[PDB]
Design an enzyme around this catalytic site. Sequence first.
Site, PDB file in Angstrom:
ATOM      1  N   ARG B  54      43.425  20.584 -20.831  1.00 36.29           N
ATOM      2  CA  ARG B  54      42.834  21.881 -20.443  1.00 36.29           C
ATOM      3  C   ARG B  54      43.515  22.415 -19.158  1.00 36.29           C
ATOM      4  O   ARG B  54      43.559  21.698 -18.148  1.00 36.29           O
ATOM      5  CB  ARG B  54      41.341  21.723 -20.243  1.00 36.29           C
ATOM      6  CG  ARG B  54      40.658  22.936 -19.624  1.00 36.29           C
ATOM      7  CD  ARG B  54      39.192  22.675 -19.766  1.00 36.29           C
ATOM      8  NE  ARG B  54      38.419  23.686 -19.086  1.00 36.29           N
ATOM      9  CZ  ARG B  54      37.877  23.538 -17.899  1.00 36.29           C
ATOM     10  NH1 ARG B  54      38.030  22.410 -17.221  1.00 36.29           N
ATOM     11  NH2 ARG B  54      37.176  24.524 -17.388  1.00 36.29           N
ATOM     12  N   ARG B  95      34.120  34.139  -8.419  1.00 34.04           N
ATOM     13  CA  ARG B  95      34.761  33.003  -7.758  1.00 34.04           C
ATOM     14  C   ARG B  95      34.768  33.278  -6.270  1.00 34.04           C
ATOM     15  O   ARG B  95      34.915  34.438  -5.940  1.00 34.04           O
ATOM     16  CB  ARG B  95      36.181  32.854  -8.295  1.00 34.04           C
ATOM     17  CG  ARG B  95      36.227  32.318  -9.714  1.00 34.04           C
ATOM     18  CD  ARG B  95      36.509  30.818  -9.743  1.00 34.04           C
ATOM     19  NE  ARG B  95      36.024  30.325 -11.014  1.00 34.04           N
ATOM     20  CZ  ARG B  95      35.896  29.047 -11.336  1.00 34.04           C
ATOM     21  NH1 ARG B  95      36.294  28.098 -10.501  1.00 34.04           N
ATOM     22  NH2 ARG B  95      35.414  28.739 -12.526  1.00 34.04           N
ATOM     23  N   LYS B 248      33.146  29.554 -25.098  1.00 32.82           N
ATOM     24  CA  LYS B 248      32.313  28.786 -24.146  1.00 32.82           C
ATOM     25  C   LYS B 248      30.945  29.472 -24.082  1.00 32.82           C
ATOM     26  O   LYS B 248      30.865  30.674 -23.766  1.00 32.82           O
ATOM     27  CB  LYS B 248      32.984  28.660 -22.777  1.00 32.82           C
ATOM     28  CG  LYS B 248      34.295  27.889 -22.782  1.00 32.82           C
ATOM     29  CD  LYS B 248      35.052  28.015 -21.487  1.00 32.82           C
ATOM     30  CE  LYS B 248      34.324  27.404 -20.310  1.00 32.82           C
ATOM     31  NZ  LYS B 248      35.156  27.426 -19.083  1.00 32.82           N
ATOM     32  N   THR B 306      31.245  18.797 -19.177  1.00 34.19           N
ATOM     33  CA  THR B 306      30.895  18.975 -17.758  1.00 34.19           C
ATOM     34  C   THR B 306      29.966  17.861 -17.295  1.00 34.19           C
ATOM     35  O   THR B 306      28.898  17.745 -17.829  1.00 34.19           O
ATOM     36  CB  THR B 306      30.295  20.354 -17.462  1.00 34.19           C
ATOM     37  OG1 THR B 306      31.294  21.280 -17.885  1.00 34.19           O
ATOM     38  CG2 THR B 306      29.966  20.520 -15.991  1.00 34.19           C
TER      39      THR B 306
HETATM   40 MG   LIG Z   1      32.031  27.606 -16.688  1.00 30.51          MG
END
Ligand SMILES: [Mg+2]
Lengths: 501, 501, 501, 501
Positions: B54, B95, B248, B306
């Site tokens: 990834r 971010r 996702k 995760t």
């Molecule tokens: Mg994420």
Amino acid sequence: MNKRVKIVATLGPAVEIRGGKKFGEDGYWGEKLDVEASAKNIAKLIEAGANTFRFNFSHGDHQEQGERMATVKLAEKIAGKKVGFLLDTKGPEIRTELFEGEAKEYSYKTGEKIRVATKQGIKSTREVIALNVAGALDIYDDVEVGRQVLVDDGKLGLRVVAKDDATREFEVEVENDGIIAKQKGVNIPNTKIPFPALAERDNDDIRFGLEQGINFIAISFVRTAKDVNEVRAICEETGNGHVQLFAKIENQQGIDNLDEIIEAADGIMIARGDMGIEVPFEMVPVYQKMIIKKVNAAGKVVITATNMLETMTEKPRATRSEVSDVFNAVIDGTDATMLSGESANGKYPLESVTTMATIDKNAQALLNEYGRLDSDSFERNSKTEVMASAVKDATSSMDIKLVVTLTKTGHTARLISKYRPNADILALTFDELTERGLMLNWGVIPMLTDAPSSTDDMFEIAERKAVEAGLVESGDDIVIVAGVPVGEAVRTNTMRIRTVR
Amino acid sequence: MNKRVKIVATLGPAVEIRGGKKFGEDGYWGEKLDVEASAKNIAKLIEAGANTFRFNFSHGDHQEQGERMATVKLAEKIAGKKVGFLLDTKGPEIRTELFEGEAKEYSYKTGEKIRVATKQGIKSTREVIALNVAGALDIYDDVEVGRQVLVDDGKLGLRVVAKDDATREFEVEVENDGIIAKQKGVNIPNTKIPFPALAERDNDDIRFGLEQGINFIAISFVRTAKDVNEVRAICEETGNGHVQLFAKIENQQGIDNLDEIIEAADGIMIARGDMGIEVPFEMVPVYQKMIIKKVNAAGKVVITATNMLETMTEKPRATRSEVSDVFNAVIDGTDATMLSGESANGKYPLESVTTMATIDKNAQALLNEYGRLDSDSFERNSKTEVMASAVKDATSSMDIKLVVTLTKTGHTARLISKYRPNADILALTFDELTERGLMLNWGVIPMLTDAPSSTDDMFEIAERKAVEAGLVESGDDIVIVAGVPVGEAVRTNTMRIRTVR
Amino acid sequence: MNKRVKIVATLGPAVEIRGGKKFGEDGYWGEKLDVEASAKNIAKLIEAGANTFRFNFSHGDHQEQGERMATVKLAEKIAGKKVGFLLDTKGPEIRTELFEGEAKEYSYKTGEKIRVATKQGIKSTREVIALNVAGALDIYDDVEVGRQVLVDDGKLGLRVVAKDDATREFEVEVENDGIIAKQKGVNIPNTKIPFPALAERDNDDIRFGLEQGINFIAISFVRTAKDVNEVRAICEETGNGHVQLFAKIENQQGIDNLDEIIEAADGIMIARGDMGIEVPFEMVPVYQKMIIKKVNAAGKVVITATNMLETMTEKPRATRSEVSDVFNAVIDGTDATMLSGESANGKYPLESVTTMATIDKNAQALLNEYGRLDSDSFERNSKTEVMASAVKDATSSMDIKLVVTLTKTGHTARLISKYRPNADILALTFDELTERGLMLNWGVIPMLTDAPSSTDDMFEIAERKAVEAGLVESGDDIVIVAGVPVGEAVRTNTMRIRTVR
Amino acid sequence: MNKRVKIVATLGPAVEIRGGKKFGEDGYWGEKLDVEASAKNIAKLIEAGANTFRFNFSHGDHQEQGERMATVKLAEKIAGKKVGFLLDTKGPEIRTELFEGEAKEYSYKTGEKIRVATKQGIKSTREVIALNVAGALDIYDDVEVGRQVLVDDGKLGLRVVAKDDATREFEVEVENDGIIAKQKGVNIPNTKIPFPALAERDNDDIRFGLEQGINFIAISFVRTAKDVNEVRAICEETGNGHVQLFAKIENQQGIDNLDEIIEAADGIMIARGDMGIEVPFEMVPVYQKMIIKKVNAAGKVVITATNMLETMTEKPRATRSEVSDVFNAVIDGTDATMLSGESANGKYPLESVTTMATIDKNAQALLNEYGRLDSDSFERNSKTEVMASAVKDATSSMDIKLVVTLTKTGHTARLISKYRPNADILALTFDELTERGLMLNWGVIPMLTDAPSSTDDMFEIAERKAVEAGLVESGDDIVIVAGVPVGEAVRTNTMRIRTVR
Ligand SMILES: [Mg+2]
Ligand SMILES: O=P(O)(O)OC[C@H]1O[C@](O)(COP(=O)(O)O)[C@@H](O)[C@@H]1O
Ligand SMILES: O=P(O)(O)OC[C@H]1O[C@](O)(COP(=O)(O)O)[C@@H](O)[C@@H]1O
Ligand SMILES: [Mg+2]
Ligand SMILES: [Mg+2]
Ligand SMILES: [Mg+2]
């Protein structure tokens, strides 16, 4: 729509024409057998869905049995379809003797005291019933006080109240009004008369049948594996190892030894006639369901027999209980259903076969919803059986019209049959003995073809033989299994899903 | 014994050597990348069971991502094993900005008062954190007093106590001790920011990756089917329709639209980091099990992501909760498990892949006992899927070491994978793009080979490739499926059970 | 909505205020315990769903344990809710010894050869690590070459390469960089040191706990039934037969003897910390599922322990793997979930309890769909258990808000709990020892009431106590069981379905 | 051991003594009825297991039916056991007429040419058979050449070869040897005769029965819900709303409308005699299993009828097909099995009831193994049904000898019956009409008792009545259900498990 449940039809005089007359017209036994007109009647039973004919050696001498078998060989060429040939042994039968005066029966009333003679080769009197015991055995020491002597399908009851050691007679009390006719079946439940594992008479009947050419032997009153193994040794000795043995389970010992009997035999005939006199009648349905499940689990053949369409001996339509019996035999998992008196002795042998076929074909469509057999629980004990499980899975996953197996010995057809797929099974085989030997396996359509060479496309063959036989057409999906390639494959190893061209 | 559950490993500095120094050593960042030494480190991750890397475009620029993809192409040559290339997009996200004077982070104590700026295009300082909001949106009017600003997957909380109209700054209180680092994900729960349909930066990132050569795109914060279809349009326009899209799911809108997202995508990544902040954390296990079930039912790929081995970022051993999480993801039915910081950022990247491989390999042995997925429930919707069912049935009936499929597009391998057979799946395919495209399907071992000609024996090729790969030896049983013959078959139509010579 | 899964919270300094300071502020251990301010913190854990407090006698002398227990008695009166009191034994622990120079640790590198001293009562050097073995045993003859000595949660590995018979030292190779700190846990897997069935120290700790007043003993490193029976004999001897024993399964012998341990104990604590160092870490989830199923089948209590919310020792939010672990423990069938460091030593003891309760309450709503336990397979081995099955059937047939049992000993509550009904279970009992003894049974809300007289209506009582406790309101349907009438009934014999007035 | 499957026996001359003579003896019909001797014969049928008598109004006039009902009321006093009274209507049917000169029948041979008249209100002769068509319809224009006229449940076929416009006579050929007797059912398949909504004769028959005192009406050839609702209107108008209506399904229209007929009726009689002529005979087993499943799901009564022991009309033993049919009806889930000619018209009416009771008693022991009904599938739609589920669960968890319900209307007993518990059901009720109304529900033993007062212990009464009835003794376990307390309970709300003192 093809019938997946196989029919065993007993042959007898009902289909036989003698000097242009039917069975029962006066002088019929005077005339000679019309072989051709008899063969045309038998061909109609084949066309209506009889898969195998039963030759009952309880009734008729070797000459009668031999002519009937030769008559069926003509019927197969008229029908353009082969059938199995099944011999059913006399076995340890007890019959009432002939009467003195040629007076063919007497009627009796409840309470009325009479006697049963054990002494062989004599004639019956109204006061003293004599028995024809198989092999002329003496049964006096084997039957205690408070047993029952049952005459003609358990219809007339005789209670043994005392024994006369001096004349070797049973002192019996008639339990219910009824007739004792000459030469009727006798049962004495809960006794263990020492009949041999294989009587000389049955040895002789089997050797005669093997000489004419048979595919199956149904062995009457199988008590142990030993009664199957003794017939096996004769089939082996005479070069007839291809012959399949069905043990008839018709008494308590046979039920008690069922597991060892199934292991020794190729199949079981549930002989409900005798079974329902020898054990409590209300237990027969319990034993029927349990025998069908066990025989299927063994990968072997089960025939449900006796009284299936009994009323059709005298009437053109069956009762609601008869239709229910045939339907429930199918749902229980039976490979085959049988006719005895209905096809052998009755007025409506063709209609009996036609009715049984209609019921059988309707019931097979409900096996998905109500079927008692569960193939999910089986151990897949070989690679061929693993391929049979995968075929069943394909026929559950999509609509498959037909499974085709190219089978040298029929082993692949029997394993696919055991799993009860939702499709007909075309078994392409390379010799008539293998072909006829598959005729009582659920869903199997046996068909003779040339052994394929190492250079032949067996999937093309499978499709052409299915189309030639009218089993599939353009757009149908079929499953084909084979050992590929020929000469290298040790077993069925290949499954193909193919759309017909 | 082979790992059937696939591993995605996120690449980052953890595996990279710079001027002979390891990640964490003094002067590391003052050195330039040592490409060969870094490729040898990555080759060890391939050997330990990483199936796909990834490249997270939320961190570092095009040059950094491009050089890292080049380093992986070298690692493949060193390992002698190919891997998948997955690009992970920024998406509609916030971010933290770069810091003034390229400080990488600061540490904060509970109760400190700092500010968060909304003005776009600026840098953070310790006292004033700046946001990079996708689409360069102003979010000042979208966030009320009392909201929580969370940094680094919810590791650090900032309470909005007041708003400064003069600077468009949130005045915040640090809720807990922690780090604010550059380019960290920011979540503001219970806020509706109007992110654009596809950020210009995602367009540039996807077109740059597609130029470098990738196999997968993981689309961050997929909200609707349109978020997938827009990336699909770019893949088709640039001649890269082979590229597979994983949506996702990491917010409520993605969960509300799951059905239409699954139909549009090639797979789902269960992005639990963002998901467990954007929706109640206690709902993430419910959504994980339901997503895994739906994607498997659709014959698509699901990746669980995760925190799977989070403690191994700093320590050589996972907690008991982490081993349980990886184990239960496998049992739930996941195709693939992911490492993020453990491989990208931690002290034990090789040990993390090794540990994940060990848990995954053990958990696959419990799938018959405890497995949540139920292939018996699926409709078999095509003749290839009927064959995949029959393969699964063969692997349930006996001990099959390997299933081999000869597959042009990977379709047969994807349908066999969907059924989760009790065996490894060797997918023999004829082009590198199909080969790498199968690297995240449960159980699939892709291998490049020559397209069979009409004169080739595909069953001989299958066994030879399996023996050459060291997957089987003399006496193992394998199932092989193929479209027979080449140049006539429309689809996989043949299953063979073979003993390896 | 009431939490059916019970929480065990370990107490420690995290909740204890000393002269107005929190744990870790400098001088905290200088000040004296503020009993009242400590009791208010503990009351908040009770209110958030702690059902039982664990007193870990591995850490802190009798004076510390005794004051903490007395502090909880104040907390119960502030919370208005009682809790269970669980003592956890030290058991056969091995720890690293204190260091010479008061230098509290040393750091080591892979390959570096050192020594482990077996000799007791000495101090550690950097070159020669000394062990504090429980009961000062000599472990030299018990540890062969090629075993591993693991320090601090299996974090630092030491391979035993040779033994020095002359100094009784192991010659060890450091396997990975790491610290050896003073007084850290040591494990040596696959060895059988002859620790007594019950050490003098544990005998003393148990007798002390029994004197303060406890409900449960968790016995560390249970290897056989004998380790449970020796503690049983002490409970019996001292008039504490009401005390329930949980065997901690934390090594291979305990797993090997699980069936005899379950039969001797009242319950099992799955002590995953040690278990995952003593057996392969990847097997712990296999053993967790199997232990929960077996303990439930026995009608006993299972506690899942260790690392459940580990990250919450230092952070206010748990990882996705931690939330997954707690959720999957519930789905697996656990009666209770436990906190160790998270509630004893961490910065967020209240939030840890609150988070665990939120996860536990969400997961219980998925037991219908995903629950691993299957009560349909149990033998109903008594009339009370027959009544428990009928209660479960009522709660499956309609929406029942609450089951109420009037239970003298709790036997009816434990049997109803075993069946996992879709309702809360109010256990009306007549003494505090029975009340507290039910606090770790799945779904049971224990409540003290007066023993009903032969003239009282127990169904009216059941409803009034449910309404008083706020568990039901007007229109709710409840199931009530009792032994009717009082003084004549030998057991629970009556089920009533009642609408609340 | 008690029979749970109920028996309906059709009454007729078979059991009746006339001037000391038995049915079948010379001069029988020249004598008048001997009421007391006939009542003693009927009392034996009650003692052997007849639970309800069927009075078929298709045979004999009001006076004959009225005297026969009086004879049964005497038989009940002799047997000391009550039975149900069921009236079976003519419905929209065709019957053969009386003959000229009160000849009762003639015999016919295959090939005879005779006529069937259509003119209403006349008598038959041997050569000219007259029809009684309900509503006195002319059917001449409704029957084409080539149709089949079937007499006596399809025992005799008549082919329509030509129609005589001059006499409105069908010219027919006798298809098979058989009897045409007076008042025999006539079927003409594939014909649409417009029978009225409710024949005047059915109105008079139902009002006469309701005056005499009946518990059930079986409505012949129910076509639609309206055929039930019209009989219901008469029952309500005359003050007989207690009377239960069984729809007889015996044609295609009844099968097409089954769902709406079940909702309107209290039960279904599967009238297979007419059904197997009016629809393909091979479909009757399919419809039987589906009807049994639907009626049980509705909590209503299903009766399987016709030919169940047909051979015992003439012979002392049933065939194997008949025993199978009775056995499979029980396994299918029937509440009740019926005798028609076997009890009404045969030589062995007592032995028929005895034989049916024996098969039924054996088959009930196989219901757990083979039973088709699945109570786990039902929605529990009321609090009484929740209690019935819980009762079934208690009888599955342990050995329960008896369930006792104290039931005012029989509702609780009907819902417990629906669930088919592994126990007999004693229904204690407070009026004779409720008592007799329960006599055809599977497993229910109705018993009259005093309505409990608010001071009575209903659990003491239950056990005492069960012990007095000889159903249980000291040490048996019973389940008792009741609405506690009397004067407050709305419904059954209490289950008690009790050991009989
Ligand atoms: Mg994420
Ligand atoms: O059986 P389905 O699902 O219709 O698939 C048929 C398609 O599969 C394919 O065989 C692709 O299969 P492979 O890539 O696995 O060889 C195509 O040739 C064909 O059109
Ligand atoms: O529980 P349900 O199905 O609503 O039935 C309630 C009805 O049942 C009855 O209790 C009748 O039951 P019983 O005749 O069995 O005593 C009525 O009083 C009540 O109205
Ligand atoms: Mg026989
Ligand atoms: Mg421990
Ligand atoms: Mg009728």
